[PDB]
């Protein structure tokens, strides 16, 4: 029939698959990220650590150009000193966990580059809107 | 004069009115949704239940096309097996509490339909942006 349990995977379902098939379904890891007298305080400090580290990822996402769009292009070019890999491989050769080792030095340079490339784009949108 | 207390209602003000007059003022139920040694823990588990179930509604809203727009069209058609009602009535005949009984079986089918209709629209926006 229509609707089967084969290609409709679950949480962390495509965790070994290639990036071109992991970016097909990103919402399944997205929605299970917030919901799911001293052992009540083990409940409190487990809950306010979940809603805190969710908001921290929604803030670093927020101050770039991506409010809730969940996939978004940007303006910074890709300097080959970061990864030096071909484009035609890294969407069907590697997998995401193999990528996260391959780049982990160069984050906080990209995250610093993204904020300035947004705030430069933000006021330049205003200067276009101000003259007209 | 200008500015009267008649049509400027309060919290849950239009709760019996029709949908065409309840969607006139939706912000009044919106803004009173977050703000307003053992009975301090009755304060803590009342606060982190308020900010948690607010973020849960802001996440289900977020992964559809509606970041903070508070009224937004979408792309899924309205199958008449859900409601089978006329359009010309349900904005001036019924009221919202009469609607919530009339549809409550068919939620989590609509909420599942909305995520796939966004993520299909999300990557197709990228494939339009990638070729040019």
């Amino acid at each position, epitope marked *: *029939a*229509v*609707g*089967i*349990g*084969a*290609v*409709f995977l*679950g*949480f962390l379902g495509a965790a070994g698959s290639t990036m071109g*098939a992991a970016s097909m379904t990103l919402t*399944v890891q997205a929605r*299970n990220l917030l919901s799911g007298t001293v052992w009540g305080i083990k409940q409190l400090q487990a809950r306010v650590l979940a809603v805190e580290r969710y908001l921290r990822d929604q803030q670093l996402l927020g101050i770039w150009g991506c409010s809730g769009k969940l996939i978004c292009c940007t303006n910074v070019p890709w300097n080959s000193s970061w990864s030096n890999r071909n484009l035609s491989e890294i969407w069907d050769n590697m997998t995401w966990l193999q990528w996260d080792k391959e780049i982990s030095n160069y984050t906080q340079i990209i995250y610093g580059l993204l904020e300035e490339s947004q705030n430069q784009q933000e006021k330049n949108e205003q200067d276009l809107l101000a003259l007209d | 004069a200008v500015g009267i207390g008649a049509v400027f209602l309060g919290f849950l003000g239009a709760a019996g009115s029709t949908m065409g007059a309840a969607s006139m003022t939706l912000t009044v139920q919106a803004r009173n949704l977050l703000s307003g040694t053992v009975w301090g823990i009755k304060q803590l588990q009342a606060r982190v239940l308020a900010v948690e179930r607010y973020l849960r509604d802001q996440q289900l809203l977020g992964i559809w096309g509606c970041s903070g727009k508070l009224i937004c069209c979408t792309n899924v058609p309205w199958n008449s*097996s859900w409601s089978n009602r006329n359009l010309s009535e349900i904005w001036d005949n019924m009221t919202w509490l009469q609607w919530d009984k009339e549809i409550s*079986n068919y939620t*989590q*089918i609509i*909420y*599942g339909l909305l995520e*796939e209709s966004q993520n*299909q629209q999300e990557k197709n926006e990228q494939d339009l942006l990638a070729l040019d």
Partner: antibody
Amino acid sequence: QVQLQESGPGVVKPSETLSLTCGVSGGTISSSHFYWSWIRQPPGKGLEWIGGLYINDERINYNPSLESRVTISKDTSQNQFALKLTSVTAADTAVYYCVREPVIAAAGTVDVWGRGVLVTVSS
Amino acid sequence: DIVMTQTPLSLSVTPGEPASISCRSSQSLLHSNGHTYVHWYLQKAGQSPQLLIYEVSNRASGVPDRFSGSGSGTDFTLKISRVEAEDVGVYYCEQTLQIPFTFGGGTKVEIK
């Protein structure tokens, strides 16, 4: 409308291999978001899933009772869906349904079912 | 393997009286995406099986209210409300929640 015709030997010998082809008329087998499957059914004894294939990832699946002997391949040169089953036994006497299943309602809301070829093993 | 048992074996139903065919899985069939992956099929003898009820308590695009789907986790009932002459055949319960797909043993309904 994709019409699925099936072909194969009606008399299959013991201890040899069985080869069944599923002709794809009115369309291509490489059409996206469809699940191509073989389904057997003994007469009046219930349906049984043999195996399947999703086109977009080239993922062949089988029945865990029957992973060992079934090899499923795609014949793009003749637009056919292929089944090869070695050491065929008496419990494989069944009618073979070739089923194309849409995984999403954007691809289709009602799947198609083949005419079915009854294959009985004898000498 | 998960077991799909069908009750009863065969029913001789009168045209008009509500008929019920039940099938029970080995575990619950509710998935996190929001759909219950339990299905029901109609088969005539000498005819390929056709889907009747997908995503139960919702009708398909072409079947009337003569068929119905209800139940909960591990308990599934197919209800035939109004019986016609074409209602005869063998019905099958089948899960599309997990791999593999397992089918029912078959429930024959005949005419009196």
